Design an enzyme around this catalytic site. Structure first.
Site, PDB file in Angstrom:
ATOM      1  N   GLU A  35       0.805  -1.206   0.000  1.00 41.29           N
ATOM      2  CA  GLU A  35       0.000   0.000   0.000  1.00 41.29           C
ATOM      3  C   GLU A  35       0.849   1.272   0.000  1.00 41.29           C
ATOM      4  O   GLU A  35       0.635   2.169  -0.827  1.00 41.29           O
ATOM      5  CB  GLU A  35      -0.921  -0.008   1.230  1.00 41.29           C
ATOM      6  CG  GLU A  35      -1.686   1.306   1.290  1.00 41.29           C
ATOM      7  CD  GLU A  35      -3.015   1.269   0.571  1.00 41.29           C
ATOM      8  OE1 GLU A  35      -3.892   2.077   0.959  1.00 41.29           O
ATOM      9  OE2 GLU A  35      -3.216   0.439  -0.335  1.00 41.29           O
ATOM     10  N   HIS A  46       1.759  12.072 -10.226  1.00 41.84           N
ATOM     11  CA  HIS A  46       0.988  13.312 -10.068  1.00 41.84           C
ATOM     12  C   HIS A  46       1.930  14.494  -9.824  1.00 41.84           C
ATOM     13  O   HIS A  46       1.659  15.627 -10.241  1.00 41.84           O
ATOM     14  CB  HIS A  46      -0.049  13.192  -8.948  1.00 41.84           C
ATOM     15  CG  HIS A  46      -1.190  12.272  -9.269  1.00 41.84           C
ATOM     16  ND1 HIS A  46      -2.493  12.572  -8.958  1.00 41.84           N
ATOM     17  CD2 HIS A  46      -1.245  11.069  -9.878  1.00 41.84           C
ATOM     18  CE1 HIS A  46      -3.312  11.608  -9.353  1.00 41.84           C
ATOM     19  NE2 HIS A  46      -2.566  10.676  -9.930  1.00 41.84           N
TER      20      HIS A  46
HETATM   21  C1  HEM Z   1      -4.335   8.065 -18.259  1.00 39.77           C
HETATM   22  C2  HEM Z   1      -3.471   7.902 -17.104  1.00 39.77           C
HETATM   23  C3  HEM Z   1      -3.802   7.496 -15.827  1.00 39.77           C
HETATM   24  C4  HEM Z   1      -4.972   7.641 -15.156  1.00 39.77           C
HETATM   25  C5  HEM Z   1      -6.272   8.298 -15.598  1.00 39.77           C
HETATM   26  C6  HEM Z   1      -4.799   6.963 -13.886  1.00 39.77           C
HETATM   27  C7  HEM Z   1      -5.821   6.824 -12.954  1.00 39.77           C
HETATM   28  C8  HEM Z   1      -5.753   6.145 -11.737  1.00 39.77           C
HETATM   29  C9  HEM Z   1      -6.813   6.019 -10.768  1.00 39.77           C
HETATM   30  C10 HEM Z   1      -8.189   6.671 -10.898  1.00 39.77           C
HETATM   31  C11 HEM Z   1      -6.254   5.518  -9.642  1.00 39.77           C
HETATM   32  C12 HEM Z   1      -6.983   5.071  -8.380  1.00 39.77           C
HETATM   33  C13 HEM Z   1      -6.810   6.044  -7.217  1.00 39.77           C
HETATM   34  C14 HEM Z   1      -7.851   5.817  -6.137  1.00 39.77           C
HETATM   35  O1  HEM Z   1      -9.064   5.959  -6.382  1.00 39.77           O
HETATM   36  O2  HEM Z   1      -7.433   5.432  -5.019  1.00 39.77           O
HETATM   37  C15 HEM Z   1      -4.870   5.239  -9.934  1.00 39.77           C
HETATM   38  C16 HEM Z   1      -4.001   4.491  -9.136  1.00 39.77           C
HETATM   39  C17 HEM Z   1      -2.655   4.280  -9.390  1.00 39.77           C
HETATM   40  N1  HEM Z   1      -1.973   4.801 -10.470  1.00 39.77           N
HETATM   41 FE1  HEM Z   1      -2.769   5.633 -12.088  1.00 39.77          FE
HETATM   42  N2  HEM Z   1      -3.468   6.668 -13.689  1.00 39.77           N
HETATM   43  C18 HEM Z   1      -2.865   6.867 -14.913  1.00 39.77           C
HETATM   44  C19 HEM Z   1      -1.485   6.950 -15.061  1.00 39.77           C
HETATM   45  C20 HEM Z   1      -0.586   6.600 -14.044  1.00 39.77           C
HETATM   46  C21 HEM Z   1       0.849   6.564 -14.221  1.00 39.77           C
HETATM   47  C22 HEM Z   1       1.538   7.088 -15.477  1.00 39.77           C
HETATM   48  C23 HEM Z   1       1.390   6.028 -13.107  1.00 39.77           C
HETATM   49  C24 HEM Z   1       2.709   6.030 -12.659  1.00 39.77           C
HETATM   50  C25 HEM Z   1       3.888   5.819 -13.466  1.00 39.77           C
HETATM   51  C26 HEM Z   1       0.284   5.636 -12.260  1.00 39.77           C
HETATM   52  C27 HEM Z   1       0.402   4.791 -11.142  1.00 39.77           C
HETATM   53  C28 HEM Z   1      -0.649   4.434 -10.308  1.00 39.77           C
HETATM   54  C29 HEM Z   1      -0.484   3.714  -9.062  1.00 39.77           C
HETATM   55  C30 HEM Z   1       0.824   3.195  -8.477  1.00 39.77           C
HETATM   56  C31 HEM Z   1      -1.721   3.605  -8.521  1.00 39.77           C
HETATM   57  C32 HEM Z   1      -2.075   2.863  -7.240  1.00 39.77           C
HETATM   58  C33 HEM Z   1      -2.247   3.775  -6.031  1.00 39.77           C
HETATM   59  C34 HEM Z   1      -2.615   2.946  -4.810  1.00 39.77           C
HETATM   60  O3  HEM Z   1      -2.728   1.705  -4.960  1.00 39.77           O
HETATM   61  O4  HEM Z   1      -2.836   3.542  -3.747  1.00 39.77           O
HETATM   62  N3  HEM Z   1      -0.909   5.897 -12.908  1.00 39.77           N
HETATM   63  N4  HEM Z   1      -4.595   5.605 -11.235  1.00 39.77           N
HETATM   64 CA   LIG Z   2       4.699  19.036  -9.330  1.00 43.73          CA
END
Ligand code: HEM
Ligand SMILES: [Ca+2]
Ligand SMILES: *[C@@H]1O[C@H](CO)[C@@H](O[C@@H]2O[C@H](CO)[C@@H](O)[C@H](O)[C@H]2NC(C)=O)[C@H](O)[C@H]1NC(C)=O
Ligand SMILES: *[C@H]1O[C@H](CO)[C@@H](O)[C@H](O)[C@@H]1O
Ligand SMILES: [Ca+2]
Length: 357
Positions: A35, A46
């Site tokens: 986590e 971000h």
């Molecule tokens: C079109 C691009 C992307 C979108 C729209 C997207 C969207 C999302 C969403 C909505 C979440 C869930 C957050 C929540 O509700 O708790 C998330 C989680 C996550 N995203 Fe993305 N993301 C994208 C690109 C990225 C990129 C480029 C990375 C990093 C290199 C990234 C890594 C992660 C990780 C590690 C999580 C897990 C966070 C957790 O488990 O607490 N994402 N993403």
């Molecule tokens: Ca920044």
């Protein structure tokens, strides 16, 4: 140079990153792809992507630690919902490890966290980003309800990223869960192995959805192929954006091209992260401290496989010019729960610090 602990490194300025990695591992990651690791890896993205060539510098400085330096601004934008925990977890390190800028801290912490996920690449890590910046403006973070055109434009505007690089970065959804998309459930994983940096997410997003891990009406969400959950083992979630990318003509073959291609996925992700980590900077102005990034946990080397309850007949394919690989299926007639914890349980609470975000 020889660091005070006796480690020989590339440049003396990289020395301080050694006790910082150790402290991050002992305090918030415990060498797991869990986590807290997940949350920091999302913060790296971000922090870095809040930059716009077209709007100019006033809109954001990229990988500049703005989330930590202005913890009450960006973390409160709706697209940054949930990012507050990661910011509050890293601010104590910024205060203690006070020779390393917030910006460098965020990038390096992301590299350390990723090294705990089997199969991840050992990211490049350049150092020297300044410790002063401005708070970014809203609207710069992609959102899961966004169209592919919107997403591709955001990434091109932010740093010249190509669609290949964009899908490459989305290998991070191989180790990723959702707490905010559906408020009734927590920790809904995007693939069946959210603690393993493998190609499962690429395969699983291509399966026909059959239900929802929580409710059926959340913005940014679409049906999941593995919705079953029990206790804290939340079922798999599917983001509209990941689904859209897997089927759009611009990105469908790239998406499929990572299924069962671990080394290609990891090398491509490393290449794209090398660009992401220096947004807002000239890489020729940053020193190379890659040798102090921990060596990543290796993959077992096994091919991707259909999880039980799924198979090749469930594929929804969208790439006419590339053959979908022959994969085996895990035995069993019904879905297996996806473990909430890296060691298989459901009880593994992440260290969390209170803070201003
Ligand atoms: C079109 C691009 C992307 C979108 C729209 C997207 C969207 C999302 C969403 C909505 C979440 C869930 C957050 C929540 O509700 O708790 C998330 C989680 C996550 N995203 Fe993305 N993301 C994208 C690109 C990225 C990129 C480029 C990375 C990093 C290199 C990234 C890594 C992660 C990780 C590690 C999580 C897990 C966070 C957790 O488990 O607490 N994402 N993403
Ligand atoms: Ca920044
Ligand atoms: C980067 O900026 C931050 C924010 O100004 C600095 O953080 C302060 O660090 C000292 C210790 O050096 C603490 O006593 C303060 O409480 C911290 N401020 C806040 C608001 O948290 C940090 O020291 C700077 N780091 C570098 C490398 O200059
Ligand atoms: C995981 O669990 C399912 C049952 O829920 C099995 O079908 C599968 O073989 C694996 O043991
Ligand atoms: Ca995975």
């Amino acid at each position: 140079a020889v660091c005070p602990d006796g480690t020989r490194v590339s440049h003396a300025a990289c020395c301080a990153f050694i006790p910082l990695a150790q402290d991050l591992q002992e305090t918030i990651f415990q060498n797991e792809c869990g986590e807290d690791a997940h949350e920091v890896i999302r913060l790296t993205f971000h922090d870095a992507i809040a930059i716009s060539r077209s709007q100019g510098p006033k809109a954001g400085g990229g990988a500049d630690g703005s989330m930590l330096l202005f913890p009450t601004v960006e973390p409160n934008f709706s697209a940054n919902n949930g990012i507050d925990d990661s910011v509050n977890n890293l601010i104590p390190f910024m205060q203690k490890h006070n020779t390393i800028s917030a910006a460098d801290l965020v990038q390096f912490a992301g590299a350390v966290a990723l090294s705990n996920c089997p199969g991840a690449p050992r990211l490049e890590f350049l150092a020297g980003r300044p410790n002063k910046t401005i708070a970014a403006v809203d609207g710069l973070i992609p959102e899961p309800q966004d169209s592919v055109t919107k997403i591709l434009q955001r990434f091109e505007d932010a740093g010249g990223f190509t669609p290949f690089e964009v899908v490459s970065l989305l290998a991070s959804h191989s180790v990723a869960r959702a707490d905010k998309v559906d408020q009734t459930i927590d920790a809904a994983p995007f693939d069946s192995t959210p603690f393993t940096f493998d190609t499962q997410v690429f395969l699983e997003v291509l399966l026909k959805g059959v239900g929802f891990p929580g409710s059926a009406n959340n913005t940014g969400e679409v049906a999941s192929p593995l919705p079953l959950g029990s206790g804290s083992d939340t079922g798999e979630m599917r983001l509209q954006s990941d689904f859209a990318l897997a089927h759009d003509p611009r990105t469908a073959c790239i998406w499929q091209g990572f299924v069962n291609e671990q080394a290609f996925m990891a090398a491509s992700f490393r290449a794209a992260m090398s660009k992401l980590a220096v947004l807002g900077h000239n890489r020729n102005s940053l020193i190379d401290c890659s040798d102090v990034v921990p060596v990543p946990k290796p993959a077992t080397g096994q091919p991707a496989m259909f999880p039980a309850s799924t198979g090749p007949q469930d594929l929804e394919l969208s790439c006419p010019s590339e053959r979908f690989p022959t994969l085996t299926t895990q035995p069993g007639a019904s879905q297996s729960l996806i473990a909430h914890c890296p060691d298989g349980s459901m009880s593994c609470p992440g260290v969390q610090f209170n803070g201003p975000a």
